[PDB]
Amino acid sequence: STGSATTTPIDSLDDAYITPVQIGTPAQTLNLDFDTGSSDLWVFSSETTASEVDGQTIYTPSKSTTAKLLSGATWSISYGDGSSSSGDVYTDTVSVGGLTVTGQAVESAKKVSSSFTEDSTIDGLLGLAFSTLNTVSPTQQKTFFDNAKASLDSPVFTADLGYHAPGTYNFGFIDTTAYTGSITYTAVSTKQGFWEWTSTGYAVGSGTFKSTSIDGIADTGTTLLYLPATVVSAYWAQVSGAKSSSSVGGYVFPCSATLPSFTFGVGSARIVIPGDYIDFGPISTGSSSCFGGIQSSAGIGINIFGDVALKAAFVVFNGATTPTLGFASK
Fold first, then answer.
1. 3-state SS track over 143-154
2. CATH number at residue 304
3. 195 and 158, same structural domain?
4. Which cysteines are joined by disulfide bonds?
5. Whether 45 and 135 share a structural domain
6. Which partner for 44 in 14, 56, 209, 300 could form a disulfide, CB atoms 3.0-4.6 Å apart?
7. Looking at the structure, do residues 123 and 162 belong to the same domain, yes or no?
8. In a 10 Å sphere around its CB, with 0-12 CB exposed, 13-18 middle and 19+ buried, how is residue 230 labelled?
9. Which of 229, 224, 204, 235 is nearest to 214 (CA)?
10. Cis before residue 323, ω within 30 degrees of 0?
11. In terms of residue numbers, what domain contains 238?
């Protein structure tokens, strides 16, 4: 089997991407944030505190003939941006782009933090990291990908995110029409539960490539690119007037600037992030100070190849017995 679904930016800045997911019988379609940095599939639901729902589409398990309470199971998760949610668990039928899993753990939110409430376009998250990070207790549950894996033509999924445009998540096959040149594969460590790999270095604009190992995670659920302070300083030093602002919470730059590209290494291959991808617009409406899309990972504890990086590539998440990551230009 295979699946193929279109993923769409939630706003004009590509702050996140939503993908339609069918849950239950008859189908209830929710727009979920596919997140390769977490491993819970959780949804706004009929059980979510009413005051914490503001425009989201909810899952109502009582209206699904295939929903079953997973008795005793609860979940609770906190993300790197400080947001959180929690609740109980149903099993139900879940389909993504024609690919169907029966008995999928659907985590029903009783509580969500303000960040989620305030985002009316995201109805939940679908985690695609390794199942070892799943927060369901007392019986840990498997991700959609893990459940689907054995049925897939090939044990892979791919992320093809658009710049200011729709893209695609495919399950079980590699679309050879979706990228240019070759795919370069690189080793993955699952020791922390993430798609963790080591980039071989970077360049700023037309500058020379610096060979240096940068350990980080491929995370579709993080908007920006978070790298070591040394790297990020080298990038923003090439933008007149750019500075790190503690009041704003990172590097800002004059909205009148033209940003340089940023290149990162995958083995001997290179992925180029165009400068436009690194512009996240005025810090506040009407401001002439703009927010940068490359920020320091210092104090996060890990480097994060988020959407800014990943949308410049066709990315293969290979879930074979020895997992790997593949990157191609497109």
1. CHHHHHHHHCCC
2. 2.40.70.10
3. no
4. 255-290
5. yes
6. 56
7. yes
8. exposed
9. 229
10. no
11. 175-330
Give a three-class secondary structure readout of the chain: CCEEEEEEECCCCCCCEEEEEEECCCCEEEEEEEECCCCCEEECECCCCHHHCCCCCCECHHHCCCCEEEEEEEEEEECCCCCEEEEEEEEEEEEECCEEEEEEEEEEEEEECHHHHCCCCCCEEEECCCHHHCCCECCCCCCHHHHHHHHCCCCEEEEECCCCCCEEEEECCCCCCCCEEEEEEEECECCCCCCEEEEEEEEECCCCCEEEEEEEEECCCCCCEEECHHHHHHHHCCCCCCEEECCCCEEEEECCCCCCCEEEEECCEEEEECHHHHEEEECCCCCCEEEECEEECCCCCCEEECHHHHCCCEEEEECCCCCEEEEEEC
Specify the residue for token string 């054995």. 150
Using a 10 angstrom Cβ sphere, with 0-12 exposed, 13-18 middle and 19 or more buried, the burial of residue 216 is: buried
Based on the fold, state whether residues 11 and 141 are members of the same structural domain. Answer: yes
Same domain, 150 and 14: yes
As for how many domains the chain has, the answer is: 2
**Residues 132, 186 within the same domain:** no
The token pair at 82 is 């400080």
Angle among Cα 95, 96, 101 to the nearest 5 degrees reads 40
Whether the Cβ atoms of residue 234 and residue 204 lie closer than 8 Å to each other: yes
71 alpha carbon, distance to own chain's centre = 30
Residue ending a domain, among 147, 174, 201, is 174
Last-in-domain residue among 139, 154, 174: 174
Q: Any idea which residue has 């890990």 for tokens?
A: 302
Distance CA 151, CA 144 (A): 12
Q: What is the resolution of this structure in A?
A: 1.7
Residues with active-site annotation:
35, 199
